[PDB]
Design a protein around this ligand. Structure first.
Ligand SMILES: O=P(O)(O)OC[C@@H]1O[C@@H](O)[C@H](O)[C@H](O)[C@H]1O
Ligand SMILES: O=P(O)(O)OC[C@@H]1O[C@@H](O)[C@H](O)[C@H](O)[C@H]1O
Ligand SMILES: O=P(O)(O)OC[C@@H]1O[C@@H](O)[C@H](O)[C@H](O)[C@H]1O
Lengths: 590, 148, 590
């Protein structure tokens, strides 16, 4: 079997980890016949692949022919789990025959590529090199075995049709991840999911300069023996856009890091949450007037996309929840984190000041408690009891009093833990100001914006992304245009409830495999057949419902959501790949 | 170097005098005689009766000063003394109890300072730490004399 | 309803906590009609009961009549959970009419009491006072309601037949806990459970001076409208001894202290086990040659009874396990604790020496790690990495070397953490020497004997009984003559596996309510129909089976055993009491 992908040497997308995790199961299935094809990169040979100068034990003549004919190729082992047998093909080794190749490419699949797009030319030459390698291999393989070709990415798939143009007896599988033109559709201020039946595809690809990319994407999809797509909604949009119904859906699987004990994922949540509290205390010095044992932590993560990630709907849902909580007379208060990496400079002076004040209060408490420990030790040694008539000392009260005096503050706490480069055009802050969330004492919803990836090297919040995710109570991911969705899957594996939509690939996948997806904590929405107001009202209702449960009910919910990690593991998702490969083999040669 | 090292002696003597610490330790003097175990040639006996005379004199002047005399006289011995090790362990247990109580007090004081108030000592009692402290004091009680 | 027991003011047995826990449910069932009868003790009125000088709101005349007639009684609230309405009757208030009472007691149930047994005379006068109180109450109650009398203990039950001698329209319930003569049977060096069909009861009660006690016990059992017994085997022995088949069995229930999280009982086991390790390290300085992550902790607790608690069978089973582990080439090592309170003086010098050596090693490690922290802090401040060429310092190695030199030991570790007053007649040490367990390096079973109740005031092992029980891995309780059994029930509530026998009340109760009692961790034995060798071989097989599982399997076993706490709670055991009371009411008056 041959895996063809452009993301073997560079980590530009999530395909890298998907392939790395799938390599173990694919190798276990295919023995030593598992080969992977990828481009050669100067930056991806140092600590990314162990180059094997020795010839392949089952393949010696083709490498010699390829090297003698001018092109340069390398064999080796990918520095990932399992046993990978990877080949790296240089992009400049055969850069001297682009004109001849495109001259003989006119009659094959009739694709044209602009001369100023280096990436498209590199993909085209990669496809030519791959089809040449397959031709050489089958010529030198004595035609004894049968070769199956699997393609994961559209740049790497351009050569697939080339194989179909050479009458090569191989099984052709085309797998796509997302539509490139669909990404630009969502920014056109035109409804996309409710108009899926009518696309003027040719022109919208034309004037937007993405015509040829979609052209060979659709050519590869049509020419392939079998076509696969990541999720159900992505399959539907491919059918209504590429005019070809995918044979089967191929959701992405993720390896799960099991623990010795089932409940350990709870303990990792217990301590990590504490690390959050020490932060929030520091961010709320002089305004800590609410019980912190009755506080809920919500968060939304991922790339800084406003409409495509559902930040706005989450914001007005939280505003509605705040309005509702001020009429029910409840004491529950929620804190919402926005891990939205943006462009920022420096830190916020007030936030660091709050951290320093918290540390100073801790130091004062430490000194007073050490004095109390000394006095109590002496009294216990003499054989008495502390009557608290000497712990006053008439001196520690002075320092504690001036500490409390210093803690006093008049201005409101800030909403950002950084300093925005621009503030008149930042959507998040404009929406927050518009809806009226200023972290006031009378409010019941707090907003914390941290436009930077969480890392242990940061001065404030000394935790990475994984620990912070494990510390929260419920992740809200109201995705709008999300092909598959990795963050909700990661949260589900970690063992926390999540809120998703059927529009997202993960939500659609979960909605069609488990009945009644409400008792397991995966709160599904409906942004496809409902208006924005209905969706936000349903989200507010879900948020209130989550706020309604007790601690025991939350423990039940998290425990039940933990058991769903086995569903997303590759051990279960490999069945779809097996089915697709078997169907391709049957279609090619019985 | 004398300030801290003396402290290391106090932690010892406290351990050797659990249940009998009825004198102020800030007014304590430490005398010692070292060297090889020679009785007449090192003046151990004269030091002993001089200290006895000093003890007799200190009980008629009504003074509070108390002296501790160490005899670093290497002799032939086997094993340790069970009472001494018991006293060290009791001192360590008292230290542990004090540490736990002071950690609880630190947590409560941290919370009260965070909310912006003062400790009124109406919640440090907890009706539970007094029980453990009381049984600790009960354990510290001793009837026999400390060993020499 | 009236509860009559001698253990209301004194804690001599476990009936005190049973009644204290049952008071809540009984009061919730009976409203304000729940009254309890108990003796008055000078030591049990200070912080044990709130005396109510005010008359009972529904009862004023009987107390006045009782006080005016010479006897002294008190009303009040028991200082326990729920709302108790307790009456205390003085034992010396009516001590001036013992002769008249026993003169008129000859024709009622024909019982005679020795003059030199003060406790029996006190019980007899208590019964007379109780029956007089019932007579006065029913005379002054206008015979409107119906009174039900419940008796829990045999000393308190002597008056029950007196009521049956006065034609009082009340329901008579007699509940027993154990047979007094059976306790002395087990010390007669004669088989007891295999000869249950033939007892020469009259004589064995005669020459053993327990004739009259059994006499009024059997009289109360026969005269009672209904008879109840703690467990099935106790019911069988009562039927074959008292010649009266109990109507229903009444197992004792225990209140369970629930937690916010289900897995918290695991966490309490995680840290408490650590407190054990710090002990065992101290007890094994200079001989720590086995991995402590693969160590199992077994223990047996309770009163110091040799045959009645199964210490010997546990000992030879552990010896067989040791012999088996030295031929399989396994690395697993088990540590067995014997919490058998005996008479001891002082501590063991070697044990305290080991604790001190462990603390000294900890101090040396702390000093070295502080120096390393300082050096690493400096190197990180200057912006470099620790190359470990300066941490040597040529000085810390000297102190570490002399520390290691001090740690060296030649003699074997001791088997006792105390100093026995006598050693030529202590069964435990004689058996240990006979079977050959000396805590040698080549052995795989370690024995630690701690003849003292575990308390936080102890210098070594600074944990109480509950934490030590929660820290172990499996409690072995091969009871032989145990009426009900509280310790295995406590262990089951705590959430740990246990080993019991059908002879014990708990084992028999569990064996008849849950099918296949092996998957839940309650390993049952058979000491009734099998010889000693068969029982010890089965125990050894069970021990090896427990040693065979992995950590995950042990977690599963403990999690499943935790769920069985609801079975032993009073919420489920109150049904038997309700049934017994209803049957008594039906028998007395329809
Ligand atoms: O999940 P929460 O509602 O915040 O509960 C708080 C903590 O949750 C889990 O970590 C455990 O159950 C802890 O025992 C509990 O203290
Ligand atoms: O030498 P002492 O009488 O014991 O005085 C006690 C200590 O002596 C010296 O170490 C220093 O002067 C210390 O400041 C003092 O606290
Ligand atoms: O029960 P054990 O076999 O000793 O396992 C050791 C500990 O058990 C429980 O306390 C938890 O599962 C811990 O995570 C585990 O470290």
């Amino acid at each position: 079997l041959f895996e063809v992908a452009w993301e073997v040497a560079n980590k530009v997308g999530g395909i890298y980890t998907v392939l790395q995790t799938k390599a173990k199961v694919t190798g276990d299935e295919w023995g030593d016949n598992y080969f992977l094809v990828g481009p050669y990169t100067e930056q991806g040979v140092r600590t990314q692949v162990e180059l094997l100068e020795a010839p392949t034990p089952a393949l010696k003549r083709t490498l010699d022919s390829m090297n003698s004919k001018g092109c340069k190729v390398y064999f080796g082992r990918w520095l990932i789990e399992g046993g990978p047998l990877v080949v790296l093909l240089d992009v400049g080794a055969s850069a001297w025959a682009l004109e001849r190749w495109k001259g003989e490419l006119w009659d094959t699949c009739n694709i044209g590529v602009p001369w100023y797009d280096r990436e498209a030319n590199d993909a085209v030459l990669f496809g030519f090199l791959t089809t040449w390698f397959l031709g050489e291999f089958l010529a030198q393989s004595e035609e004894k075995p049968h070769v199956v070709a699997h393609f994961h990415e559209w740049l790497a798939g351009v050569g697939l049709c080339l194989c179909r143009a050479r009458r090569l007896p191989v099984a052709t599988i085309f797998t796509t991840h997302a539509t490139l033109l669909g990404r630009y559709l969502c920014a056109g201020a035109v409804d996309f999911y409710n108009n899926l039946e009518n696309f003027n595809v040719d022109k919208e690809a034309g004037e937007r300069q993405i015509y040829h990319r979609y052209c060979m994407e659709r050519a590869a999809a049509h020419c392939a023996h079998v076509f696969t797509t990541v999720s159900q909604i992505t399959a539907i949009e491919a059918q209504h856009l590429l005019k070809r119904k995918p044979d089967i859906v191929t959701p992405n699987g993720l390896n799960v890091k099991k623990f010795s004990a089932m409940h350990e994922f709870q303990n990792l949540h217990a301590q990590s949450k504490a690390r959050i509290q020490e932060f929030v205390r520091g961010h709320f010095y002089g305004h800590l007037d609410f019980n912190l044992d009755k506080t809920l932590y919500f968060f939304i993560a991922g790339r800084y996309e406003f409409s495509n990630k559902g930040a706005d709907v989450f914001l007005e849902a939280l505003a509605r929840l705040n309005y509702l909580l001020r009429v029910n007379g409840s004491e529950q208060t929620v804190v919402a984190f926005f891990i939205m990496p943006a462009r920022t400079n420096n830190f916020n002076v007030e936030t660091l000041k709050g951290q320093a004040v918290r540390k100073q209060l801790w130091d004062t408490a430490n000194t007073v408690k050490e004095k109390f420990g000394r006095k109590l030790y002496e009294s216990l040694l003499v054989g008495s009891l502390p009557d608290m008539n000497k712990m006053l000392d008439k001196e520690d009260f002075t320092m504690m009093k001036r500490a409390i005096f210093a803690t006093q503050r008049q201005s409101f706490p800030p909403v950002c833990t950084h300093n925005m480069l621009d503030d008149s055009s930042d959507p998040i802050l404009t929406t927050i100001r518009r809806i009226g969330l200023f972290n006031s004492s009378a409010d019941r919803v707090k907003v914390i914006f941290h436009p930077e990836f969480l890392s242990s090297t940061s001065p404030l919040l000394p935790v990475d992304y994984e620990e912070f995710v494990r510390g929260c109570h419920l992740g809200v991911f109201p995705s709008y245009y999300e092909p598959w969705g990795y963050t909700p899957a990661e949260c589900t594996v970690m063992g926390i409830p999540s809120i998703s939509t059927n529009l997202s690939g993960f939500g659609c996948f979960m909605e069609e495999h488990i009945a009644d997806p409400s008792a397991y904590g995966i709160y599904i929405l409906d942004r496809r057949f409902r208006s924005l107001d209905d969706s936000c009202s349903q989200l507010t209702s879900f948020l209130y419902s989550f706020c309604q449960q007790s601690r025991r009910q939350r423990i039940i919910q998290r425990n039940r959501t933990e058991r769903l990690s086995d569903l997303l593991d590759w051990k279960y998702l490999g069945r779809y790949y097996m089915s697709a490969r078997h169907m391709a083999l049957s279609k090619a040669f019985p």
